[PDB]
Amino acid sequence: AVRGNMAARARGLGNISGNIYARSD
Amino acid sequence: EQVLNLRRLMEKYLEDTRFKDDFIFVAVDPNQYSVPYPTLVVMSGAKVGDHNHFFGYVLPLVAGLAPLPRREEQGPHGNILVPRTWVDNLNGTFINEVMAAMYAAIGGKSNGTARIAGLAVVTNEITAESAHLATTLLSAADNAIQTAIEIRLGDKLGLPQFNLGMMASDQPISSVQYNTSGMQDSDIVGNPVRSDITVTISNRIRQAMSDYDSQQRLVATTGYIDLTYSPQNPTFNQGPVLVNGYPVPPTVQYQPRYVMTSAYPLELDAFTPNTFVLGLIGTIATLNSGMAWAQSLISNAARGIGPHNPGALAMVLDPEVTAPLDLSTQTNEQIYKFLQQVLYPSLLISIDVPEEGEYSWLLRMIPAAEKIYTGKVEGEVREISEGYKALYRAFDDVTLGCFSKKYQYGLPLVYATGNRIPLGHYNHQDGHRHDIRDMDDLYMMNITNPDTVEAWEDSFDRTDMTMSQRVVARHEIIDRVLSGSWEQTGWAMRYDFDPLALQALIEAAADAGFTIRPENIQH
Amino acid sequence: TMRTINRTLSRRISRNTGS
Amino acid sequence: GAFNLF
C-alpha cells in the first residue's frame, strides 16, 4: 500500500477574515 | 482514611461561611457498596415548583492502591495484552451503586431526583495538611453543579448565560508566550501539562477622567505543535496540490498540527461552554496573526541539538544526510526559508478530550456532536441528533444568531481520528516531572532510528489497525524508549474541527461587533 | 458591563480572595 | 464509554 494520511491535508485552515482585527485609530 | 480527612477538611472550611447547609457529603466504601475504590460525593439541590432536583460530584480516591494488571483480548492473529488504568474500572455497575447511595442519602425516591454532574480521579495522597487541594476540589464541584443547574433550568429559573454582547463597550486584547525550558503547567491534582504555547485573552479598561489604565484577564489556553506525515502523489495523473490557491514545492510532505491541551479561567468565577467558545475564538484569531505559529519552531531551533530540534527534517529533505542539522547560527528568515520547503503553509486544529478530569463534563460535548444523523425512520427529513444540536445552539448563541445565517444547518463540525492517547508523567533530567506527551514525531526523529519513526507513524496513521493494536504498539515503543520508568494516570481521545465551520464562526463573530487586537505579535 | 460580570454570573465558592 | 457513562 501507500503510507501517510491523506485526509489530514484537506482539513488544514489556511486563512481567516480580516474584519476580526481592530482597525488602527 | 482518605475519605475521612477530605470530608473533615471540607466541613472545616465550610463551617465559617454562610453555605453550611447548602452541601451534603456522601461516603461510599467497598465494605457496604459494590465499588472498586473509596469515593466521596458532594451533593447540592435546587427547587422548582414543588419538586426538588439534586446533583452530585464523584471523587474516587486511589492513592496507595496497586496498579491495574493487563487484560488479554482477542486479535486477528491471536491474543494480546492491553494496558489498563484507573478509569477502566468505572462501568455501569459503579454508576448504579453511586446513584443508589445518593438516593439513600436524600431520603428516598419521593424526596426528589438525583443526577451525576461530573467525575474526577485523585491520584495523590490526602493528609491533614491539604486544605488548599480540598478548597480547590470544592470550588470545582460547586462550579460544575451550578453550571449543570443553569443548563437544565435556566428558562424556568431566569438564569442568563455569557454571550458576545457583554463585550460591546470595551476593547478585547490577546497575548502569546513561547516557553519550552523549565517547569510546565499543572492541573488541579498537580500533574504536569505540556504548555509549549500559551494564549491569554484579556479586556482593556481606561478611566474616563483620571486616565488610569488597567486590564482584566479572562481565560487562558495551552497547547503545542505536532507533525503529520502526508506525502503528495503526482504520479496518479492528478492536479497539483493547491493551498490557498497556491502551488507548493514538490518536496513538501509534512502537515503541521496544533493540539489543545487545557483551558481554564483566570479571573472569571464561572466557566461555561460559551466561555470555552470565546477562548477557542481568541486562540484561533491569535494563532493566525501573521504566521505566529511557526515562531514556536523558530524559537525551538535556537537551542541547538536536542529532542525538539527542527533540524531533523534535513534527513527527510536529503536521503544522504544522516545526522540532524544545527540551526543555532542561522537568522530567522533563513530558518523560515528552510521550513518552507518541507511544511505545508496551513494549520490543523485538534483537541485532546480526557475521559475523566476537572473539565471532562464540559468537554464531553465535542464527542457527542460527531454523529450528525440518527438512523430513525423519517417522514421527509432525517432526524438530527442531540449533541450536534447542542453544539450548534452554543455556537449560534455565542454569536447572537449570526452563525445560523453563515453556516448551513446539518454540515459536519467535528471529525473523529480514532486514536487513544495515554496520560502520565516521567522524571526529567533537569529535576522536574514532565508530561508524557513530550514523546512525538520530532522526538523519535531526533532520538531514535528510522524504524521506530516508521512504526510510530504507522500506528498513528494506518486504518486497518484496531484501537487495541495501536495502543499496544505505542505502549511498547514508549516502554522501550523510557526503560519502563514512567507512570500512567488516564486516557484521552483526539478530535479535530472542520476548517469551514471555523471560518464561518470567525465571520459570524466579526459580524456581531467583536474585534480583537493582538499585542505580542512580532513581524 | 464586563466589570461586574462576577456579580451577574456568580458562584458560591471563589478561588481568589485577595488581601 | 466514559462519555456516555452519565
Numbering used by the authors:
A (entry chain C): 591 to 615
B (entry chain A): 64 to 586
C (entry chain B): 45 to 63
D (entry chain D): 626 to 631
Paper excerpt:
In response, one family of large bacteriophages uses a nucleus-like compartment to protect its replicating genomes by excluding host defence factors. Combining cryo-electron tomography of nuclear shells in bacteriophage-infected cells and cryo-electron microscopy of a minimal chimallin compartment in vitro, we show that chimallin self-assembles as a flexible sheet into closed micrometre-scale compartments. We find that the shell is primarily composed of a single protein, chimallin, which self-assembles through its extended N and C termini into a closed compartment.
Overall, Goslar chimallin shows high structural homology to 201phi2-1 chimallin despite the low overall sequence identity, with a Cɑ r.m.s.d. of 1.8 Å within a protomer and 4.8 Å over an entire C4-symmetric tetramer. The NTS, CTS1 and CTS2 segments of Goslar chimallin show near-identical interactions to neighbouring protomers compared with 201phi2-1 chimallin with the exception of CTS2, which is shorter in Goslar than in 201phi2-1 and shows a distinct set of interactions. Thus, together with our findings on 201phi2-1 and Goslar, these data show that despite extremely low sequence conservation, chimallin proteins from divergent jumbo phages exhibit high structural conservation at both the level of an individual protomer and overall nuclear shell architecture.
